[PDB]
């Protein structure tokens, strides 16, 4: 599947959903952010973290 658009860390869409889930739930402080939720992810190496999406 190759429809234009350069191939990059598609995971970008995965971390984007997490950060949003923060406010959607009622998060606080403006500390939440893609790069922010991303660093914490590397600690899990997208391991069990990728399970949250399951099939």
Cα gap 28→11, rounded to integer Å: 24
How many structural domains comprise the chain? 1
DSSP H or E segment with residue 10: none
Q: Among candidates 19, 21, 25, 18, which has minimal Cα distance to 50?
A: 18
> Taking the CB of residue 15, how many other CB atoms lie within 10 A of it?
21
Residue 28: give the domain boundaries. Answer: 1-55
Q: How was this structure determined?
A: NMR
| Residue position matching structure tokens 């190759």 | 2
Cα gap 43→17, rounded to integer Å: 18
CATH of the domain at 8: 1.10.10.450
């Amino acid at each position: 599947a190759k429809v234009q658009a350069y191939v990059s860390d598609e995971i970008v869409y995965k971390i984007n959903k997490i950060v949003e889930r923060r406010r959607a739930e009622g998060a606080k402080s403006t500390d939440v952010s893609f790069s922010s939720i991303s660093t914490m992810l590397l600690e899990l190496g997208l391991r069990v973290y990728e399970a949250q999406m399951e099939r």
